[PDB]
């Protein structure tokens, strides 16, 4: 199967989101369950993103103020502004990291059911607003080629 892009359907994007969230929560010791080189590369890119982010800025969760009623709008506002003037792989990694932070904060704030919702919101946003761009810019394959090297 070398003729088409890796993870080229919404079903694959869903799997990518669920595995990402499981990883980000596992880094905190929180167990949760709802292309392999793709999952691996995204783990690495998000971790390296976070390292850099934290060198410059305070904890991402400091800015959130989650409640069950407002979490969806909070997510939508941030992600809309992130992509308002365009998409690139760096912004996509930022999107995954933001989603991860939202999930971690939900669990910290004893709102663990929100994790399942956030997973849904990320999957829908990916499929509605990023997937076209991903296919048009080389698939997850291009991401693996660009972000594969560990620096």
């Amino acid at each position: 199967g070398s003729m088409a892009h890796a993870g080229r359907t919404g079903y694959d994007n869903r799997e990518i989101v669920m595995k990402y969230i499981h990883y980000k929560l596992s880094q905190r010791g929180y167990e949760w369950d709802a292309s392999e080189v793709v999952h691996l590369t995204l783990r690495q890119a998000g971790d390296d993103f976070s390292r850099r982010y934290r060198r410059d800025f305070a904890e991402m969760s400091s800015q959130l103020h989650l409640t069950p009623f407002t979490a969806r709008g909070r997510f939508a506002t941030v992600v809309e502004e992130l992509f308002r003037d365009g998409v690139n792989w760096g912004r996509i990694v930022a999107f995954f990291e933001f989603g991860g932070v939202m999930c971690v904060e939900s669990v910290n704030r004893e709102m663990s059911p929100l994790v399942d919702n956030i997973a849904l919101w990320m999957t829908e946003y990916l499929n509605r607003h990023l997937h076209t761009w991903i296919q048009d810019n080389g698939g997850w394959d291009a991401f693996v080629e660009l972000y594969g090297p560990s620096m």
Binding site: Q63, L64, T77, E81, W89
Partner: peptide, 20 residues
């Protein structure tokens, strides 16, 4: 909020320029 998205965006943009 807006501040958060700007931080995510600029960090993202840096990371995508570095990949180039």
């Amino acid at each position: 909020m807006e501040n958060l998205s700007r931080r995510l965006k600029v960090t993202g943009d840096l990371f995508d320029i570095m990949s180039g």
